[PDB]
């Protein structure tokens, strides 16, 4: 078979939910992605090597003359010279500073990597930043695939696009691909006719909630959130509003502070 493109997958300040989302890949599934589509050359969650052997695997991939794609999960802690997060006794700041400028393409995957995420919420004790913010002085320009976690459809679609075209797709003003992030959740929502008719559930226990009325008065952030949730859904089967719960705005920068209280508008 032809040589497969190298992927280096980094974990910074993260919960591993973004890694888990990639495992949910569907048509293609994750086995197809790592056996046929790509060469997954470093990934702390699943790789066989540990310790020094793992570090060596990372070095081998990064210095390949074929180049590599970096997929980055998690925010970069920058307070106190980066000491709140270390791997192999190097700060995550230092690791990303050395590796990411060498990548042929960088994908920041998840709201943490894109915008700083949960650890960057006030008062941000670790000085966590998204990739582009943290490494702007080094000219790193990551494609941002937001969400907490994102839809893995959006990661695989971006990778496939890059492999085909050797370029990023059209990006929005937050560096997110417009093919996935071009519409608000709300404008795609099945409950939109209720919003538009002023038909709001007043509580989760109400008959209006039972009948599927709009969740705006219960805090829904769909109107101010860009994502493809109602269209693609998750796990081939559901998404928050169809489970009766408001959108919390999880693909938006600083949503933890901008969209709270979550049960209010």
């Amino acid at each position: 078979g032809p040589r497969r493109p190298s992927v280096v997958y980094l974990h910074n300040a993260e919960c591993t939910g973004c890694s888990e989302s990639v495992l949910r890949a569907f048509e293609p599934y994750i086995d197809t992605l790592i056996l046929d589509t790509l060469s997954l050359d470093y990934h702390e969650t699943i790789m066989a090597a540990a310790g020094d052997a793992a570090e060596a695997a990372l070095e081998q991939a990064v210095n390949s003359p074929h180049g590599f794609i970096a997929v980055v999960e998690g925010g970069i802690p920058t307070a106190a010279n980066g000491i709140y997060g270390k791997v192999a006794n190097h700060t995550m700041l230092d690791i990303c500073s050395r590796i990411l400028p060498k990548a042929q393409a960088v994908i920041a995957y998840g709201t943490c990597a894109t915008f700083g995420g949960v650890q960057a919420a006030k008062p941000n004790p670790t000085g966590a930043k998204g990739v582009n913010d943290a490494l702007k002085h080094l000219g790193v320009k990551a494609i941002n695939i937001a969400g907490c976690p994102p839809n893995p459809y959006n990661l695989v679609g971006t990778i496939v696009y890059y492999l085909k075209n050797k370029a990023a797709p059209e990006l929005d003003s937050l560096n997110r691909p417009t093919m996935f992030f071009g519409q608000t959740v709300h404008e795609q929502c099945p409950r939109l006719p209720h919003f538009d008719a002023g038909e709001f559930a007043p509580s989760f226990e109400s008959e209006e909630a039972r009948k599927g009325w709009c969740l705006y008065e219960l805090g829904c952030k769909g109107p101010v959130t860009m994502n493809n949730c109602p269209k693609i859904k998750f796990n081939q089967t559901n998404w928050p509003v169809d489970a009766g719960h408001p959108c919390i705005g999880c693909s938006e920068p600083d949503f933890w502070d901008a969209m709270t209280p979550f049960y209010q508008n």
């Binding site: 078979g1 497969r4 974990h11 300040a13 591993t16 939910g17 888990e20 989302s21 495992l23 569907f26 994750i30 790592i34 056996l35 060469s39 997954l40 050359d41 702390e44 969650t45 699943i46 790789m47 066989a48 090597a49 540990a50 310790g51 052997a53 793992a54 060596a56 695997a57 991939a61 802690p77 709140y84 997060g85 270390k86 791997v87 995550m92 949960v118 650890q119 941000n124 004790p125 670790t126 907490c148 976690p149 509580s203 989760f204 226990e205 998750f234 796990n235 089967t237 559901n238 998404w239 928050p240 169809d242 489970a243 009766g244 719960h245 933890w256 709270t260 209280p261 979550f262 049960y263």
Partner: protein, 533 residues
Amino acid sequence: SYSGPIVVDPVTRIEGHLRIEVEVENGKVKNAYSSSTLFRGLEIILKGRDPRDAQHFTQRTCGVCTYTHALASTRCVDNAVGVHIPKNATYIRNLVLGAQYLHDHIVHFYHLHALDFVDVTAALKADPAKAAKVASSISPRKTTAADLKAVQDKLKTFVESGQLGPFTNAYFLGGHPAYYLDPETNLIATAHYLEALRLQVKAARAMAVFGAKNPHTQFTVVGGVTCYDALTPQRIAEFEALWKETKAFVDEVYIPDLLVVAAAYKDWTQYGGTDNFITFGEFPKDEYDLNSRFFKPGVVFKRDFKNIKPFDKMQIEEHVRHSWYEGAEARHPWKGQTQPKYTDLHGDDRYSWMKAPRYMGEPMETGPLAQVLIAYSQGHPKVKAVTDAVLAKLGVGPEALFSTLGRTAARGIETAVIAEYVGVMLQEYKDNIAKGDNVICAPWEMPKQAEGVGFVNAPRGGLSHWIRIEDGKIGNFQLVVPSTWTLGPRCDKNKLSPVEASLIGTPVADAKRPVEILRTVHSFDPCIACGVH
């Protein structure tokens, strides 16, 4: 034999950022340190916020044990406000949790643990027809020579490409003295590793049927759940079908592989033991009574299972003397504090971002071995039947459970038991709907001042979230997480934590490829984002 230090950083095939340091003499570990090397500070971030928001933040403690912290925070705030949630909310929450256990443990055994035991490259030397006969002898599911050949051919193409990917620099490349399986057994396990990559998609989907999405569910609220669609026959049938397929994989693939591996590695009954166990119970009928749970809470000291002690939540204190926090005060979590102060590795005798929880001053293992052993000792009939069948098949006595092998076995036992119990909960839920109960959420009111606690027994053990509500806002919110118990550092009495203690005596055949350390560490299923938050 090797004498000197071994450092494993990163420990891969866990959640989060762990550094293990050991001292080895004459080929055996004589000391160990568990160093967690990422801090986020979710407890600091929560201060002053709306208690209703807590579950959304705390769920992001961990996406491997997704849902569990949303459930713990919701139980915590439910408890603080004094709401008695409807029966269906308890059923739906319990069903989603049961599904989480199945997903988590399947992925752990195959995708995190098995590469410590399975030489995937040796599978290329196997006769697939012989491998299929072996597989068919250990499971009611018949495995064909042709299906194992398909796996082998795919692997051959992958290895021959020279791009080994996740197998680059594996400890098993070229063979390793501590890797014992024959080629046929390696092929069976490798085939099932690949099968599990697809099966886990279905196991996770089961959570999204009621819970919106996986990872990070979105269906819980203070007072109950939001998912009216979960009452429908269509959604229930969808969940049921996914559950049935998942259970079949547990019973017919995971458990037989676990037993074959355990039988080949019976020497691993001799390493990785611990003394004390704590568990919180799970799957309640009554949200205000831990002893209404399918598994019950309990505390055991010094392997004394004849004298199980009641769990007293006031006997938990989290130490910081060997952690990167200010001072040396051990605090109960309703008086918890999270005051970072980094000193570098071993600076001021500190080496981790985890606190060190102690129960009556003692280090406690939690997780599947604790839940299984304590439930067995309480007379739990399902746990006893499965545990006894496993011991009989392996030809070992109960003492074998106090080990790395035993812990790994207990994870499977719990998976099998919970897989069955999910069907019982599902039937009770259906029966409740059939009687006319279509309520899923109860009204409640925020007190200006209150304390609450929520308890979950998660896939890695006893999880507790603790809130102090002041002026209707979060005055304090503290998480004490299973991996904090198990993988936290020493306390101010210098007592080794369970993982540290378990590592003493581990043999190491090749210090450059220290798979023995990984076998024991991985048997605890570490989750460092959980442990530190």
